[PDB]
Design an enzyme around this catalytic site. Sequence first.
Site, PDB file in Angstrom:
ATOM      1  N   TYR A  27       0.536 -12.238   2.608  1.00  0.00           N
ATOM      2  CA  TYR A  27       0.988 -11.492   1.821  1.00  0.00           C
ATOM      3  C   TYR A  27       1.918 -10.208   2.387  1.00  0.00           C
ATOM      4  O   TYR A  27       2.968  -9.911   2.117  1.00  0.00           O
ATOM      5  CB  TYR A  27       0.261 -10.985   0.573  1.00  0.00           C
ATOM      6  CG  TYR A  27       1.117 -10.176  -0.475  1.00  0.00           C
ATOM      7  CD1 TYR A  27       1.581 -10.775  -1.508  1.00  0.00           C
ATOM      8  CD2 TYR A  27       0.950  -8.822  -0.123  1.00  0.00           C
ATOM      9  CE1 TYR A  27       2.615  -9.806  -2.200  1.00  0.00           C
ATOM     10  CE2 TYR A  27       1.868  -7.894  -1.388  1.00  0.00           C
ATOM     11  CZ  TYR A  27       2.570  -8.628  -2.302  1.00  0.00           C
ATOM     12  OH  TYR A  27       3.388  -7.859  -3.199  1.00  0.00           O
ATOM     13  N   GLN A  85       3.979  -8.866 -11.055  1.00  0.00           N
ATOM     14  CA  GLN A  85       3.773  -9.445  -9.598  1.00  0.00           C
ATOM     15  C   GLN A  85       2.913  -8.480  -8.997  1.00  0.00           C
ATOM     16  O   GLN A  85       2.412  -7.500  -9.115  1.00  0.00           O
ATOM     17  CB  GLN A  85       5.078  -9.409  -9.079  1.00  0.00           C
ATOM     18  CG  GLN A  85       5.775  -8.010  -8.972  1.00  0.00           C
ATOM     19  CD  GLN A  85       7.205  -7.929  -8.023  1.00  0.00           C
ATOM     20  OE1 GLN A  85       8.043  -8.605  -8.676  1.00  0.00           O
ATOM     21  NE2 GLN A  85       7.285  -7.164  -7.040  1.00  0.00           N
ATOM     22  N   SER A 107       2.464  -4.121  -3.737  1.00  0.00           N
ATOM     23  CA  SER A 107       1.846  -3.242  -2.634  1.00  0.00           C
ATOM     24  C   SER A 107       2.431  -1.583  -2.968  1.00  0.00           C
ATOM     25  O   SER A 107       3.356  -1.322  -3.745  1.00  0.00           O
ATOM     26  CB  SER A 107       2.761  -3.499  -1.520  1.00  0.00           C
ATOM     27  OG  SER A 107       2.779  -4.980  -1.010  1.00  0.00           O
ATOM     28  N   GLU A 122      11.625   2.889   4.971  1.00  0.00           N
ATOM     29  CA  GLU A 122      11.473   1.400   5.123  1.00  0.00           C
ATOM     30  C   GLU A 122      11.387   0.991   3.625  1.00  0.00           C
ATOM     31  O   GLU A 122      11.830  -0.309   3.152  1.00  0.00           O
ATOM     32  CB  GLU A 122      10.372   1.300   5.884  1.00  0.00           C
ATOM     33  CG  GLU A 122       9.734  -0.254   5.428  1.00  0.00           C
ATOM     34  CD  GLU A 122       8.446  -0.765   6.733  1.00  0.00           C
ATOM     35  OE1 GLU A 122       7.909   0.192   6.821  1.00  0.00           O
ATOM     36  OE2 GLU A 122       8.568  -1.943   6.702  1.00  0.00           O
ATOM     37  N   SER A 158      -3.420  -6.434   6.708  1.00  0.00           N
ATOM     38  CA  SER A 158      -2.069  -6.554   7.030  1.00  0.00           C
ATOM     39  C   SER A 158      -1.325  -6.654   8.416  1.00  0.00           C
ATOM     40  O   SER A 158      -2.516  -6.450   9.342  1.00  0.00           O
ATOM     41  CB  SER A 158      -1.647  -5.207   6.512  1.00  0.00           C
ATOM     42  OG  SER A 158      -0.202  -4.967   6.439  1.00  0.00           O
ATOM     43  N   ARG A 213       0.748  -4.993   9.350  1.00  0.00           N
ATOM     44  CA  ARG A 213       1.149  -3.498   9.361  1.00  0.00           C
ATOM     45  C   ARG A 213       0.034  -2.433   9.005  1.00  0.00           C
ATOM     46  O   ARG A 213      -0.004  -2.075   7.939  1.00  0.00           O
ATOM     47  CB  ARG A 213       2.142  -3.175   8.695  1.00  0.00           C
ATOM     48  CG  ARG A 213       3.639  -4.041   9.118  1.00  0.00           C
ATOM     49  CD  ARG A 213       4.332  -3.141   9.814  1.00  0.00           C
ATOM     50  NE  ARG A 213       5.262  -2.415   9.460  1.00  0.00           N
ATOM     51  CZ  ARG A 213       5.417  -0.970   9.763  1.00  0.00           C
ATOM     52  NH1 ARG A 213       4.716  -0.320  10.984  1.00  0.00           N
ATOM     53  NH2 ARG A 213       6.079  -0.112   9.068  1.00  0.00           N
ATOM     54  N   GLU A 273      -1.914   0.047   3.368  1.00  0.00           N
ATOM     55  CA  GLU A 273      -1.828  -0.697   2.051  1.00  0.00           C
ATOM     56  C   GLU A 273      -2.844  -0.806   1.159  1.00  0.00           C
ATOM     57  O   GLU A 273      -4.047  -1.539   1.322  1.00  0.00           O
ATOM     58  CB  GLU A 273      -0.902  -1.886   2.107  1.00  0.00           C
ATOM     59  CG  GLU A 273      -0.652  -2.379   0.956  1.00  0.00           C
ATOM     60  CD  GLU A 273       0.028  -3.799   1.085  1.00  0.00           C
ATOM     61  OE1 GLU A 273       0.472  -4.116   2.054  1.00  0.00           O
ATOM     62  OE2 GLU A 273       0.253  -4.710  -0.217  1.00  0.00           O
TER      63      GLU A 273
HETATM   64  N1  LIG Z   1       7.292  -0.355  -1.754  1.00  0.00           N
HETATM   65  C1  LIG Z   1       6.254   0.192  -1.032  1.00  0.00           C
HETATM   66  O1  LIG Z   1       6.197   1.314  -1.098  1.00  0.00           O
HETATM   67  C2  LIG Z   1       5.325  -0.497  -0.176  1.00  0.00           C
HETATM   68  C3  LIG Z   1       5.542  -1.849  -0.310  1.00  0.00           C
HETATM   69  N2  LIG Z   1       4.692  -2.733   0.925  1.00  0.00           N
HETATM   70  C4  LIG Z   1       3.495  -2.074   1.578  1.00  0.00           C
HETATM   71  C5  LIG Z   1       3.507  -0.677   1.344  1.00  0.00           C
HETATM   72 BR1  LIG Z   1       2.244   0.077   2.200  1.00  0.00          BR
HETATM   73  C6  LIG Z   1       4.444   0.061   0.370  1.00  0.00           C
END
Ligand SMILES: NC(=O)c1cncc(Br)c1
EC number: 2.4.2.31
Length: 223
Positions: free
Chosen positions: A75, A141, A144, A156, A179, A181, A186
């Site tokens: 994911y 949905q 995140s 980002e 993750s 990342r 997250e």
């Molecule tokens: N849209 C978002 O703020 C976000 C989206 N994906 C991961 C993370 Br951490 C933050």
Amino acid sequence: PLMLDTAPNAFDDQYEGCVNKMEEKAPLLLQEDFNMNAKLKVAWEEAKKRWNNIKPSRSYPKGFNDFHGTALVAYTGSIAVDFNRAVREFKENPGQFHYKAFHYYLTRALQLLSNGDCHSVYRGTKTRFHYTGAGSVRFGQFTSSSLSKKVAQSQEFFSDHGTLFIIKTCLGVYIKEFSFRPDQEEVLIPGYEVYQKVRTQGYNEIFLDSPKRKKSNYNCLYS
Ligand SMILES: NC(=O)c1cncc(Br)c1
């Protein structure tokens, strides 16, 4: 601009009363999802390798297995966009949901990792969201968010044209250790968590609070 509502079209299965039945059927369905979704198959194969590397690190709840670990890793990868789309557009084209097992394993992973703790998280977007004006809201949905306001506000995920969600979640789960990342800190929020308190702040801030678990529109659909 998109609307912030109750997400009536989103696939929101919580699998109440059919956990074991899905456990038994999901392996076959996962294989079917792959046959109907080549990208998913690639993303899963990539996530499996990452998961094989990270799992030796710690321990997990009773029942948590490779399907759950791999789904979470996946994911946080590239499959997210299409998956969130399919979940969001479910009711509009049910026969095109090639994530039958994926959705189950991800949902169950979040359920297994969840304790009663609540987190203060933030979610930034490039798309402006407008509260419909009445009633509680839901994302529908998987959603995140981050423990870090800086991450959520980063280039980002956010822009002045979008929205910064300031959220208090109590079903969200910290998935940093899964993750691709880890730096994003997250917290993954299930689409079935409802926010009974919605306050618009300035033009690009929406405060979501008073989170509650709420019965879903779909239940054990593929069991
Ligand atoms: N849209 C978002 O703020 C976000 C989206 N994906 C991961 C993370 Br951490 C933050």
